Amino acid sequence: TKIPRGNGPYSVGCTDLMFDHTNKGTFLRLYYPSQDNDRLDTLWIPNKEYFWGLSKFLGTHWLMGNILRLLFGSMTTPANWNSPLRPGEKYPLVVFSHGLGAFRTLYSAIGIDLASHGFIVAAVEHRDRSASATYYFKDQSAAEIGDKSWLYLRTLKQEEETHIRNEQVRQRAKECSQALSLILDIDHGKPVKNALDLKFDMEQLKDSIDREKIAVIGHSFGGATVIQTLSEDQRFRCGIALDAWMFPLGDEVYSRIPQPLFFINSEYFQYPANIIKMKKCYSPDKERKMITIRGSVHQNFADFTFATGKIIGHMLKLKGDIDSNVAIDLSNKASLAFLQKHLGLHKDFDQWDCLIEGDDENLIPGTNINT
């Protein structure tokens, strides 16, 4: 309800796609330009098990599962559920990676605005036990009955945290790459039965993708995922990391990324040892940009920043000094400028080229971290 609508000229539709039905299959939330704009009725957090997951992730016990569920379980996100895809054009494609303790639906402000500008967006649900919860189906008949098998976030011991996070960011890359393949193959006529039954007939996606214009975007853990993904998959033509958390990356990725890469940071999350990994990505033969959003906290990139009031927002570290709507607008617009330059879109997004440069009252070029 407080989650912002898309600022762009397209109406936006949302749906979910699972294929195959297994735990090794692809799971994504799709945002896309809808043909019609009949009602904004997409449920934001669609299953109790996520409120269970959040609670477990956040430190809380069981009751907070229910309190969070009672507070939010009905909240909508401004997209037309299962609305038909708008026809007659090929859309550039974004694949989006959520952060630690998140899942596919918690970045709709980004997803939706992006779609309102001519993007199809596939927000993937990671099955590396980095999501709070996720689910899949043990067999085809389970999928048919809606007999979901749930997978909750894994917590790690110190000794564990270097091998595991990296094993995880490798899986996340394979999952971004795989979702890309799912879509691309649908785009070229591969018949697919969605493991979920939904009004939206997946066949509409046929011949609807501009295959030269793919980008990968993610937040935090998802930002590290952007960098691994580009590393291994040149179908992704540029990436955008929203406050990347660089710890899961091996030292080998830095020399391996040729595509242009964009760092959008928050002022209050970054720390020098994180930043120095970002600087390791810079090379005169490569395009790396970096802006910092002033007054912004880590959470400014996800949807819970528009879910509480100004006071409690700041208490829960969900909101910062900057306005949540002013922030996400800067990030979204800075992104559209960047996506236009390196995918060679023919739109008016260059009108925010300055936001790539930090030319704003609320933007800092580079980073506040002096080194």
Ligand SMILES: CCN(CC)CCN(Cc1ccc(-c2ccc(C(F)(F)F)cc2)cc1)C(=O)Cn1c(SCc2ccc(F)cc2)nc(=O)c2c1CCC2
């Ligand atoms: C150590 C694990 N936890 C416990 C301290 C760290 C949690 N954390 C920061 C954070 C702050 C607030 C909330 C929050 C979300 C919803 C609510 C409520 F529902 F109540 F409204 C309240 C609080 C969630 C995470 C992080 O882990 C930050 N983080 C995140 S937060 C992304 C996220 C997760 C859940 C969510 F709901 C929204 C955003 N992602 C990452 O990839 C990484 C990090 C750190 C390193 C890598």
